[PDB]
Design a protein around this ligand. Structure first.
Ligand SMILES: Cc1cc(C(=O)Nc2cccc([C@]3(C)CCNC(=O)O3)c2)nc(C2CC2)n1
Ligand code: NA
Ligand SMILES: [Zn+2]
Ligand SMILES: [Zn+2]
Length: 384
């Protein structure tokens, strides 16, 4: 449960965000000015919160704002992520000044989360006023699914979302559900907002085959580059500037819900196209036919996508999850966090999954089958 998001609670997030900005201003970090840039995002998040407060301009309106389900979750998540960034610096020490460290990679994961939370609050409280209950999902067939299972909710727990999505599009494993959570839960708060749902269904449309589109285009396609800036697209394609037709497709933290396809022209330049609210596989098929998109990430083989007009290893899901924040999630159910450690193997899972395995007379540890000599309750952090 989350506390009421009253003025005092909102101001506590500002004080935590101020500490994060000051830690990130350390000259030793050499933090680059490129999206997601925490030094721009946190001041812009304070400004949007200030704008919301200015619209709920009396004690009656403040009381209604403080009990809004989405706003309580947002403020609780912002508090947690800001505390996590402070803890990152406290535990990371001198490794924060090494650009290639896992600690600095974790700061990039948090910067992406802050960027996505700012985009989310701007979409749910446009001009500072709550419109979550009136949110217009871009694809009507996706909107009908959200209205059927969640009515006019602005946000729902991941556990409930996953179970309901499975009733329409079957998810075949815990690892697939984990990769799917990492893809949709962009704010990494264990909830799916109607805004996060809108982004996912725009990217992986058409709705009728959404999980096939996602498994093919994001999890296994060699052209997929996840969140990149244009400087990063150029750096990836530069080595293929003498191979016209070399291409990649990326997500953009400043253009959520849209793809950007970077490609090498016949004259060796690197350009990009933003497909116009149409399926990505159709833009890639058309571009292949026209001779523009031939070699994904410069590779000799371009996967045939025509099966998407009318498969994934457990390793492929694992590799896809590396950039995300799902280490704390139980890999067996992909719906509860890891809360038990087995001795002596050290494997982690939720107690509900371990109990189910033991009640089935499963041999030892669910993962490695070794004898369980003891168990211990544990708390797992996404950056452990
Ligand atoms: C260039 C770059 C890009 C990314 C990056 O896109 N992060 C990311 C974070 C969370 C979720 C995702 C999803 C949507 C799902 C899991 N796998 C994906 O490919 O996309 C990506 N991260 C980093 C470093 C690790 C912080 N660097
Ligand atoms: Na979320
Ligand atoms: Zn579990
Ligand atoms: Zn084990």
């Amino acid at each position: 449960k989350q506390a009421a998001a009253d003025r005092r609670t909102v101001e506590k997030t500002w004080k935590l965000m101020d500490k994060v900005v000051r830690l990130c201003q350390n000259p030793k970090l050499q933090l680059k000015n490129s999206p997601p840039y925490i030094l721009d995002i946190l001041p812009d998040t304070y400004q949007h919160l200030r704008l919301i407060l200015s619209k709920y301009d009396d004690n009656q309106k403040l009381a209604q704002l403080s009990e809004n389900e989405y706003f309580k979750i947002y403020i609780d998540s912002l508090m947690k992520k800001s505390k996590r960034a402070i803890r990152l610096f406290k535990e990371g020490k001198e490794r924060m000044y090494e650009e290639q460290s896992q600690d600095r990679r974790n700061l990039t994961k948090l910067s992406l989360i802050f960027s996505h939370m700012l985009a989310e609050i701007k979409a749910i409280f446009p001009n500072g006023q709550f419109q979550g209950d009136n949110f217009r999902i871009t694809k009507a067939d996706a909107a009908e699914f959200w209205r059927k299972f969640f009515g006019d909710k602005t946000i729902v727990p991941w556990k409930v979302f996953r179970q309901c999505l499975h009733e329409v599009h079957q998810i075949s494993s815990g690892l697939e559900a984990m990769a799917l959570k990492s893809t949709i839960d962009l704010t990494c708060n264990d909830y799916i907002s109607v805004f996060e749902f809108d982004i996912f269904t725009r990217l992986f449309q058409p709705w009728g085959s959404i999980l096939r589109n996602w498994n093919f285009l994001a999890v296994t396609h060699p052209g997929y580059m996840a969140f990149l800036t244009y400087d990063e697209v150029k750096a990836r394609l530069q080595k293929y500037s003498t191979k016209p037709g070399s291409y990649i497709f990326r997500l953009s933290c400043t253009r959520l819900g849209q793809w950007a396809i970077g490609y090498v022209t016949g004259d060796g330049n690197i350009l990009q196209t933003i497909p116009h609210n149409k399926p990505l596989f159709q833009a890639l098929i058309d571009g292949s036919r026209e001779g523009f998109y031939l070699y994904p990430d410069g590779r000799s083989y371009n996967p045939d996508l025509t099966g998407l007009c009318e498969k994934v290893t457990q390793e492929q899901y694992e590799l896809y999850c590396e950039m995300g924040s799902t280490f704390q999630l139980c890999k067996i159910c992909a719906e509860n966090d890891k809360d038990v450690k087995i001795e002596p193997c050290g494997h982690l899972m939720c107690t509900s999954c371990l109990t189910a395995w033991q009640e089935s007379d499963g041999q030892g540890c669910p993962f490695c089958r070794c004898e369980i000599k003891g168990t211990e309750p544990i708390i797992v952090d996404p950056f452990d």
